[PDB]
Design an enzyme around this catalytic site. Sequence first.
Site, PDB file in Angstrom:
ATOM      1  N   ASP A  35       0.825  -1.198   0.000  1.00 26.37           N
ATOM      2  CA  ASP A  35       0.000   0.000   0.000  1.00 26.37           C
ATOM      3  C   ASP A  35       0.862   1.252   0.000  1.00 26.37           C
ATOM      4  OD1 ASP A  35      -1.898   1.920   0.330  1.00 26.37           O
ATOM      5  OD2 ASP A  35      -2.484   1.351   2.373  1.00 26.37           O
ATOM      6  N   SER A 199      -0.444  15.569 -12.095  1.00 19.25           N
ATOM      7  CA  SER A 199      -0.676  15.220 -13.480  1.00 19.25           C
ATOM      8  C   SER A 199      -0.915  16.477 -14.306  1.00 19.25           C
ATOM      9  CB  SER A 199      -1.873  14.284 -13.556  1.00 19.25           C
ATOM     10  OG  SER A 199      -2.288  14.040 -14.883  1.00 19.25           O
TER      11      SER A 199
END
Length: 330
Positions: A35, A199
Amino acid sequence: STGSATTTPIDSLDDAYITPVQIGTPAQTLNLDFDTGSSDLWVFSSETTASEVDGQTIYTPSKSTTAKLLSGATWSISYGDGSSSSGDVYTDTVSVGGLTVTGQAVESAKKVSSSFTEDSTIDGLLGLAFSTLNTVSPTQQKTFFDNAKASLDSPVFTADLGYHAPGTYNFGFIDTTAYTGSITYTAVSTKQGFWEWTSTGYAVGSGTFKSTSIDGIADTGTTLLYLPATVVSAYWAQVSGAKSSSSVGGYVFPCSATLPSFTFGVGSARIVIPGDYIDFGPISTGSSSCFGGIQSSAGIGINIFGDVALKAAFVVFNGATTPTLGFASK
């Protein structure tokens, strides 16, 4: 040193991925959910409340000659999805794919929430976010990666998740045969303890690319792709019959649909998520309403590039003094 381990979807939907981990002496192999959005290595154990264990493999520290109670240490974690666990702490030897760390904090669960009990395939979590998020008190502990780093050939790990297929976590090296073209690296902020990056935009299907900054985290422990409501609406508007269902808890779409791809930007590069990766199947057995793999982050408070996005790429988690993230197509 290096390590390399195969990671395997837990079910036919790729809801999560499990990776075998050796704990203790002699080894006890547990299948853990790696994770990159959390920083605790915790396991089902001989200390876990019996009624909360249903099929998981447990770690029994009394059977490990290298286990030592970390006296006075406790831990307690709550994940974004509302699941939780807590307990006490041992140190022991932990190996992943041939890479061994001695003195790793292994957090033994005394209590786990129902979602963990109900998932018989996940024996615990192995956190790979920054150690500043580790929940052990009163002495915070380091992640497996942080402990391994100095020994690694290069201070990196990579995630290569499969679509409906196994993939690989590598530690200490970049497998240049595992991706196509080049890896594009992008800046990381560690301010919130995550692999947080920005992004450069998105496209829906064959549509034009929208240049827009989207801050979010690379999180292997989250199944879906959670993005701003504007972006998500633009995606689902291209699917006839798709709608946001308050009763179901997100966007659903007719199972008869063919889904468009979704592209996200990494600098000047582009990662394309095929439409099929966005299909999470019937909301309930036999239903013709299917659950979408792109969902709104509104009210999460952060955008999350979860498995839906990451499995479309070869992803480098570069833990150099100034961390960065790399993405390549594959």
